[PDB]
Swiss-Prot record, chain A:
Transmembrane segments: none annotated. The gene is nirS. One of its GO terms (cellular component) is periplasmic space. This is Nitrite reductase. PANTHER family: DIHYDRO-HEME D1 DEHYDROGENASE (PTHR47197:SF3), PROTEIN NIRF (PTHR47197). It comes from the Bacteria. Binds 1 heme c group covalently per subunit. Binds 1 heme d1 group per subunit. Its EC number is 1.7.2.1, 1.7.99.1. It catalyses: nitric oxide + Fe(III)-[cytochrome c] + H2O = Fe(II)-[cytochrome c] + nitrite + 2 H(+); A + NH4(+) + H2O = hydroxylamine + AH2 + H(+).
Length: 539, 538
């Protein structure tokens, strides 16, 4: 009773300013669920789970009811020239369905489940204990030259032998694996699905097999391993889109250790954002840390794992909509794209500060980028764009080239916009650029190639999907990727689930077709990661 | 192109994202009537999103499962585990309780956020630092001044220690919770439960406000940078709503950084949507602030060496962190995890949790009471709300390792409902109030222990009776010494329409020394002696 009177006073919060949400149009269960289904299949991607993920005004009740039924239907029907597609004019959705979506977004956002340690541990499984694993490589595969390829819609990945061009093993994983990363020892391949399901694969087993698995959220895209001297296979980190968090697990067993929320204040307006999805994650070579990208808030977190019981995080402000990125040639500066802000943030991992924000083209999408030495400007890091056909070259040598450091030193012009990946290798005098989402089929099915030794000459167009000899289907070409020795570049001919796909290999020295990988198992091939190049960040 | 890039389906399954409702319909006046009772009577314990109390949360999933009648009965009779009885006591009507039962079955109404735009809008520089005096422009004994909170008046009074007179009364935020001093000893910082901060220059002809800002909707703590070379550099404040804390310029109060405390709990490691910020103490070992985050049980070490790239070290402790203070050496932060009945020891130098000491029922130390025990060496003590015990915890790892972080001994007071324990380097007494004890005579008096003879029972000083105030609850609260340590002040916290007073005792003789009355002295609660607060003398 004493403690009850102690905490008995009135809250300083005024009841009058605490608002009940409603005033939305009536819709039955059948109706609400149908809309909700359409929302996560078609809208959530850009707008997010809580509808504050896209640029412009959020789709929350305060705003939507202000706009009204008519405006919403009209907006959803025709779209806008700023990234919002037209669902009615295209014939994607029916007027009946648009009427439902307009009603739906006027309601409070249905809540998805949280996912903490109890859920994580429940999902955690150690298939083969560290003790029961081989002490040395039990097969005679050339592991460094192996290619972990994603068989997207199949919810699997295929290990492809570099030299033989044959599929060695097919493994079941989470749905639509987004990326593959390698442990610092080069022994374990880590894969994570969009469903946030991670799988640890042992390349030393007689036949490469899964030794651990866990689910770190409802939705995810990134996973990474400790790469600081003396931390080989110590920790594994993964970022989720929902819930807004990242989890640190044991590098050997995938046992969940810490889960950290990314919900917080934005860099630009410094207001609270309830859903800051975790984008790229890269491991620091200068300090025992993980460099995490937090999209909507535009923050780059340096999570120190030297002591994970008492986690130390340094929050660096960058720019809103942080997505992909990669290291500069020296592996000290994290060159990351803030695509909707049309900028590239430079994070110094040694000094641990934002070195600069470079202005670039419309919607920069560098992937991990492409590093090379410019004859005139010295070391540069480059990126292509989704918003245009330009390629930005940024100087990355502060020490010996201060005149060009962090400057969009020069540009190149590819086939057009819709570009996803740019690429090159130390031993190569070529630069590859795809155009996966370019609305012109001929362009989307081919890749441009520049001559690093004559940057003034126009690119050469390589007909990848055509060299595939596949037949009907979109046949979208995506992500150029070199082999261990960098004498050949691989491309994925991303065709439909019921269509035929392939992996095309070009002779880097001659720019001629060298091979074409086909297999009934190769369904919707997307990302490809050569074991050596991914592990040693060779790009 | 970008529309096809971001055009695939979300990995989130539509079938698992849930629409909330199935709640008892209620009109606007019914919902508002209930909502007003919730924030007047319930929010304190349960919180804004109803997950602040122990036991099950009052969210729709649990409430609708329990149902209408279960809820009404629970609200009507309460429970022996801290939930008051509203019907049995006759506080709420059967009609209102029914409204409350239906109300908690609905989604919790949302209070607004409070970011940088809102913060700057409230920010005001009343007197620019360049226009402020360069020397003390008055004859006041600043070190021995007491900053007294006149709770319901939304003001504070600066009382002269020796003269016992009200030197100045200042308008502030409502019900100021605490007063803190800057390291230079020039500025006094006060923050109201309404999250409104006020900076006061004691060097002006008449001590006056030079700056003000609002850092949330509800708050309790504020603090200034005390690391060497950082005198008056930054000012931090923690809020209850939103769940955040803010760092500002320590000269102008200009908002600089805002950090959300929403996160994962230390125990269950699950997501908590409302981890309120409790105590905050400035480190002397490193340039960092030590923040207590309640519901998640985390102690954050926020480094201000580079405010642009904020570094924060998260130390897990135990759930329900509240008040705390330094050990005699000013190196270990002794803080109470009140509902967990534990005191967490945070090593500010090595930056780690040194221990979790089991204590009595609901410990409430305030900043605590340090002193050297004849047998056990230097200890830190704390009283309780749940019982009449007083825990003495060893705080010397160097010379008394056998006693370090151990509940070395115990003392017994008049009973539970205690809030503060006090002593001083120059004093040989130990005072403990019992403010919320259900017995009028007990709540109106304090206990005093002889530190030179701890085996002996305590003496009871009749503080309220010495005040000669007449009717009213006359709750005595928080002992506080003067700069010399020979006087101990107490507040006689009566109603706003009643008469209150400040009683002063001669520490050397335990005899009444003075009584401070004044028509302006409305509902006096916290009292902060400038020197003692500034140099953490307790
Ligand atoms: C955050 C993020 C990264 C960087 C992770 C890292 O390196 O740590 C990344 C990288 C990648 C990489 C990494 C390549 C590399 O070289 O590192 C690939 C191949 C890839 C295949 C695709 N990505 Fe990706 N991608 C997203 C998110 C991301 N993708 C999306 O949210 C988006 C826009 C929408 C979606 O549907 O998920 C999206 C669409 C795509 C595709 O359309 C691709 C081609 C096929 C697919 O499965 O969706 N993304
Ligand atoms: C977080 C917190 C601190 C530590 C701050 C710091 O050290 O930086 C504190 C300290 C304090 C201190 C500091 C004393 C000290 O000597 O350090 C005082 C005087 C004080 C007066 C009161 N507090 Fe306090 N107090 C709360 C919160 C807190 N109180 C509550 O939430 C609670 C339980 C409920 C409420 O109504 O706010 C509460 C009730 C009270 C009271 O009932 C008091 C006596 C009168 C009032 O104004 O409500 N609290
Ligand atoms: C990304 C590829 C998108 C998808 C898929 C959908 N929307 Fe969108 N939407 C997107 C952007 C970038 C914007 C801003 C447009 C602008 O000109 O500012 C929008 C905007 C809307 C709006 C209007 C918001 C307002 O101003 O009040 C609505 C109502 C809207 N989007 C609805 C919506 C629905 C219902 C969608 C799926 C069926 C959907 N969007 C998909 C980006 C994208
Ligand atoms: C702290 C001083 C409290 C105040 C004021 C109010 N409640 Fe509370 N309540 C409190 C605790 C510690 C608990 C747990 C009690 C237990 O023995 O488990 C509760 C519990 C409830 C519940 C029941 C939760 C459940 O089991 O489903 C309800 C419905 C409840 N409290 C309602 C409620 C209302 C409506 C209040 C204000 C009018 C209120 N509580 C105040 C602590 C405190």
């Amino acid at each position: 009773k004493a403690a009850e009177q102690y905490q008995g006073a009135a809250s300083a919060v005024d009841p009058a300013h605490v608002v009940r949400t409603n005033g939305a149009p009536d819709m039955s269960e059948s109706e609400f669920n149908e809309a909700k289904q359409i929302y996560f299949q078609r809208c959530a991607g850009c707008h997010g789970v809580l509808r504050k993920g896209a640029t412009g005004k959020p789709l929350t009740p305060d705003i939507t009811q202000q706009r009204g039924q008519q405006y919403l239907e009209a907006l959803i029907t025709y779209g806008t020239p700023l990234g919002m597609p037209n669902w009615g004019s295209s014939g994607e959705l029916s007027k009946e369905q648009i009427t439902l979506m307009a009603k739906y977004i006027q309601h409070t956002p249905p809540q998805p489940p949280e996912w903490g340690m109890p859920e994580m541990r429940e999902s955690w499984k150690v298939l083969v204990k560290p003790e029961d694993r081989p002490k040395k490589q039990l097969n005679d595969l050339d592991l460094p030259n192996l290619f972990s390829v994603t068989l997207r819609d199949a919810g699997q990945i295929a290990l492809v032998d570099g030299d033989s061009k044959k599929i060695v093993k097919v493994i079941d994983t989470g749905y639509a694996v987004h990326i593959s990363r390698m442990s610092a020892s080069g022994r374990y391949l880590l894969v994570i699905g969009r469903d946030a399901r991670i799988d640890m694969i042992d390349l030393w087993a007689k036949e490469p097999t899964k030794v651990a698995e866990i689910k770190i959220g409802i939705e995810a895209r990134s996973v990474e391993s400790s790469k600081f001297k003396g931390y080989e296979d110590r920790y594994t980190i993964a970022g989720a889109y929902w819930p807004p968090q990242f989890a640190i697990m044991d590098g050997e067993t995938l046992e969940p250790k810490q889960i950290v929320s990314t919900r917080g204040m934005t860099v630009d307006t410094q207001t609270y954002h309830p859903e800051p999805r975790v984008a790229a994650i890269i491991a620091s070579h200068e300090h025992p840390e993980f460099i995490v990208n937090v999209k909507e808030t535009g923050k780059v977190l340096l999570v120190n794992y030297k002591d994970i019981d008492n986690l130390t995080v340094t929050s660096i402000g960058a720019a809103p909509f942080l997505h992909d990125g990669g290291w500069d040639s020296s592996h000290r500066y994290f060159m990351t794209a803030a695509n909707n802000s049309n900028k590239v943030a430079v994070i110094d991992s040694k000094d641990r500060r934002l070195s600069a924000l470079v202005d670039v083209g419309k919607t920069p999408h560098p992937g991990r980028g492409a590093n090379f030495v410019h004859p005139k400007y010295g070391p540069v890091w480059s990126t292509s764009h989704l918003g245009d056909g330009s390629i930005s070259l940024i100087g990355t040598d502060p020490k010996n080239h201060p005149q060009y450091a962090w400057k969009k030193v020069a540009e190149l012009q590819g086939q057009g916009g819709g570009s996803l990946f740019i690429k090159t290798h130390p031993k190569s005098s070529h630069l590859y650029v795809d155009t996966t989402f370019n609305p012109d089929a001929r362009i989307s099915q081919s890749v441009a190639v520049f001559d690093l030794k004559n940057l003034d000459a126009k690119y050469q167009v390589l007909p990848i999907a055509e060299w595939a000899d596949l037949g009907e289907g979109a046949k979208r070409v995506v992500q150029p990727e070199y082999n261990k020795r960098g004498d050949e570049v691989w491309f994925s001919v991303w065709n439909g689930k019921n269509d035929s796909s392939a992996l095309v290999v070009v002779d880097d020295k001659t720019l001629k077709l060298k091979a074409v990988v086909k297999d009934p198992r190769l369904i919707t091939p997307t990302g490809k990661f050569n074991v050596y190049n991914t592990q040693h960040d060779v790009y």
